Amino acid sequence: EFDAIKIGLASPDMIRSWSFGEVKKPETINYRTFKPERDGLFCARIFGPVKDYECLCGKYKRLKHRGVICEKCGVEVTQTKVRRDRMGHIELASPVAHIWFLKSLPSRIGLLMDMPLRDIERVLYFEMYVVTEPGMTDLERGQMLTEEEYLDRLEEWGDEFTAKMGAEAIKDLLASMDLPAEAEQMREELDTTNSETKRKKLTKRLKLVEAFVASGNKPEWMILTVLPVLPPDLRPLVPLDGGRFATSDLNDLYRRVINRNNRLKRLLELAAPDIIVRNEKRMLQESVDALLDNGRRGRAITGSNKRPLKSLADMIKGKQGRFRQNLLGKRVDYSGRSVITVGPYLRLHQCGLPKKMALELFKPFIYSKLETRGLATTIKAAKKMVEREEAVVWDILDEVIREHPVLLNRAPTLHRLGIQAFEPVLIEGKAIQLHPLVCAAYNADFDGDQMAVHVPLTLEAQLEARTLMMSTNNILSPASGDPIIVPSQDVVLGLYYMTREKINAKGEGMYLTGPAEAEKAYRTKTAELHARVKVRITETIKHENGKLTTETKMIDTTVGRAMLWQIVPKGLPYSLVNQKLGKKQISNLLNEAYRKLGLKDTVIFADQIMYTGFAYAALSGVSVGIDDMVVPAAKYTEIAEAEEEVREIQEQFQSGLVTAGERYNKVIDIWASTNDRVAKAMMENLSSEQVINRQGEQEKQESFNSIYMMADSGARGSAAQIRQLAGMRGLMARPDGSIIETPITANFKEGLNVLQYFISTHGARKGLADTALKTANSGYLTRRLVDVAQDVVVTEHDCGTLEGVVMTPHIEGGDVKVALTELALGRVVSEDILKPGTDEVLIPRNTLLDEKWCKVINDNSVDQIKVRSVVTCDSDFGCCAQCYGRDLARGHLVNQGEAVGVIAAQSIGEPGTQLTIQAKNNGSVKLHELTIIDEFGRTKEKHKLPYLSKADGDAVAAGETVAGGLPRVADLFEARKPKEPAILAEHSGTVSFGKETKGKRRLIITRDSGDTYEEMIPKHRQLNVFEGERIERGDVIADGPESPHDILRLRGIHAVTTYIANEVQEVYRLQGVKINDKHIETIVRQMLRKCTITFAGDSEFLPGETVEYSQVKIANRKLVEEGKEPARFERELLGITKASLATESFISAASFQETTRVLTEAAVSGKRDDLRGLKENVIVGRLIPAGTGFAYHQDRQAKRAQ
Amino acid sequence: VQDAVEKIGNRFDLVLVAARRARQMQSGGKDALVPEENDKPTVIALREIEEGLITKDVLDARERQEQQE
Amino acid sequence: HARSTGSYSLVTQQPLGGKAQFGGQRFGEMEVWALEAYGAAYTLQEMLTVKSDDVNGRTKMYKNIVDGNHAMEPGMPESFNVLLKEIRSLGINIELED
Amino acid sequence: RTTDPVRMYMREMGTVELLTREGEIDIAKRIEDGINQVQSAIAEYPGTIPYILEQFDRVQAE
């Protein structure tokens, strides 16, 4: 229907064209008949009838008189919904300035008329005159005259000039402006001005003037002479129970405006002193600004409830505004909500749904099927049949939901796994039954959690749920590619208990034909689950090339391991099961099954694994008791020793040998050491036992303690938890950060007294409050990240570029932080991977690195490679499939139309809550910084070189001595300037000292061309470089944190990308969170989209203009095709917020934040939104240009091009 | 849906073609090329795509033949 | 709580909120983000238009379900028209082009 | 210096001194003098007196 949206100033003619009449009275309704009053705020003659196809008289009342005007009323006989569309207008007695174009800094009126804002307010507030027409007089336009001064120059000239007051004077000044002549004057001054600040002033004013000239808008339209009036149904006055009425504040504001306007007309008719007219005009201006934006101009008007009235701007802006409460988020039909229980009998694609809830949700479908099969003649018969709850109604409901997927959601929805499609199974009850294996995806536990359910209606939605949203499809984490349906808690405990090993168990040493005989022996009580036996195992290997090789052989194992092998699918080695199985082992099993067998086998294997784990956890009988918290006997003696030597050191302190701070520090150190030793002793005591084998010798065996098993299996609990249960709680902190000298020496088994519990609460309250605030901080960060990268959609397949990023293993000392396989898995190479020391091509170009090629790279010991990356992609809009690589949640190459930006933002934002020289290797030494490389050629040590046993190329042996988390992420993504940034080298030249000016110091640099540049360095700066030294561009002058803008400006795009990626991955890796770096690269690409045009060329671009990058790239391509002067640019780095507010579409920017500023800018400029991104299409109800709708939008630009 | 997306190549195109086939079988008078086995039209269309009977080119050819007649 | 079709708001023409009002669950911003990440464009369009504030669309959708057609003719959400009216009321001309 | 219109209004009205009884009589005399001059100016019109005369003719007839 429509293809674009414009915005711009509204002329009085346009407002009159919108209006269906003029509101002349503040009347709303009659107090007796409750009917609309004529020429009022709710007039039926202006806005339409109150009843459908009726008029206020009652003479024309049926549909026969549609479209006729009641000659004695004027009410058009039509539908009442026209009262939601028909607008009115008020003819203001005096012009009123628009509040948005006056007080939203920068003031458009202010810099169009090149005079300060306070001057304009003084004129508007009726305090100072302005000369509009100077005539044959020395006065100049815009010069202010006081009242007495005004009479002086009136009596000394007369009618030769004109001086006025108020918004009328501003309108006269703005209407007489000759915009082209002003523009020419600004350009001429711009060329001939030598001050850059003045240049910024003039370029702003010239941009605004040229925007006015090109958009066709006129400046005088910023002053309102006709005020539009909203339709009554959007500002309702409706009755409540008991005769009370509910109204909107817009009614009060409009009534105030109308009353003051009518009083102004009355005062202009009955000739009044100028003071009264001036006061009335002030009131009119104040009322209009309050209606448009309450509280901006001054004190906000309050209603009868003593709270500020909320205006149109408040109704379009804010968290509770129309954009965010009703457009980007809505309440929907065919939805339900219930508490969630656990269904251990369900499959991965099934969810338990209550019968009553499904009956309510699927009511129209039941009606349709009852009508189709003939059990109901009409729809009311079906309604009563459903309400009476017959049996055939239940059969119809069974057949309706037979293959109708349903969407389950849990709030908050941090990532896309928070909503999934399941097949419903009707259960008698009131709670939704959820499969355990999906709980980790929902972050759901059964302590009172509630989930929402939604019913897709059309066939497209059902197939999207079945293909994309089905729980069986989403079993890989899109953030890292690891499985998300890994078992936890009782499944892990059962698989651990079944796979443990015991000495001298019943049936030890027996020979078994296979897993079936092991199960038979277990069921007959011949052998225990932990008996060490020999089993004949037939094992099939599927190789990388697909070869299927089966080998049968005798393996030493346990009974439980064979019974678990009974369910393992063919194609996996037995070594994956011939061990005790913790959480990591089961995760490895699932990963291997996915990598070598596929998806269906993985789902079946996971279901069988969780069945078996639950069954044998139930059969184990694992229980927690007070005797399982064994407290080592060494704890009491060690506490006694620590206390005695505390007494000794306190006595020594009384002798004055050491100070108080030293005593505090060493007491803390001894208490930390005592805690560590007590924890170690408790772990050693708890982790082992002594048994008797078949020979009678005492043997050392792993303990079967319940808490030890829980902690070691990874089901729940860690070493620290056991330490507080059975050892020492340790040192706790005073709530300002300081650590109390005395620690807690009692665990939870023995119990604490009053002060120990008080110190515990000190930290408990802080932890709770920190979680509460950090959740909101992470939510705001993820909102910003979603909005900055919402436009990124895979639009092509190959972008035809040669650029790429060079990747190496990360080294932060003498050990690796991440292997090259982890970083290179799922990417596409840019240039051919040549084998080191050889010219052969091991890996060709444009090939995806899967596990096989990763193992190849690991075998051939490649240190550095280079692959395609999103930021280096040169697609005009979005990115291409090759530059993005593998889709982590799917395992293959990313499909066209994938919203990679939203996935990236969710992946980064989801773990926000979890947030807060001796050589060691044998090899050679290389200098660049110091590098130590093994004989294979992999650089495995990177060390700093402050300004050495071995020189360059000298071999070094082992042991030779050559010699705050989430705020940090937010600051990195906002590109915040450090408080004390490191000063960098602007250009490669020789350093020299300069004149030490008072206050702060100056330095000079001499370039290769002999030009000298002066740098302004503060006094309190540690200066590193020395005079006469040629420092390269980007060298550190003063140490400190590096600003991202500086490294982008001086070093390059790859440098800033690497910096941001490394910092973000460091903060996410300290907490042990796995996030792929392509998401960060997408965010960085969205951070690099603008450019300051330096060399203007001739493509219409002012110097110093912040244009957007791909427009320049396209324009440069056309210019090259024309062989005519191209343009040169410098790329800027903008934070996610600033980049979001700087996007081309004004709808998305308005919906994000700062709606008033964005709307004012767009309206003055006359912007045009073409609806290319996700958010605008979401707001206007159209299909998003991503995923299933992508092709549809493509067809649109197939039509617009033709 | 692994077989269907393997035969078609793209999940989104698979969804669109299956939706077209399901609407043909439901709104129109077209009959299934495979035994229904008491299945909804979406599942029948997915099974048809899995068996390789139905693709975008086949649907376009059938639509062209219907338009000709 | 479960709702197929019930009461609607006076101004936004959207389903009410709460069990007491027999309202509907809220599909917030993050749910839309998840649907966009999946790529389910048609499901998102269903939630935005024919389930919340497209009056003619939702009526015809109910009729189609009763007639066993399971297809939708999406229209313009009423909230967008309300927003256009508000922006027009602020003396700002916002319009649609063909 | 201020944004509340009330304070500006009081500033503007506070610049004129308060009147006394004699000032009130003087202003009332000026108003009456102006009204008398207007009445005298209108009375010098051939069409004014006939209107008053015919109005009195209709009034006296009850």
Ligand SMILES: [Mg+2]
């Ligand atoms: Mg919970």
Ligand SMILES: [Zn+2]
């Ligand atoms: Zn009438």
Ligand SMILES: [Zn+2]
């Ligand atoms: Zn590319």
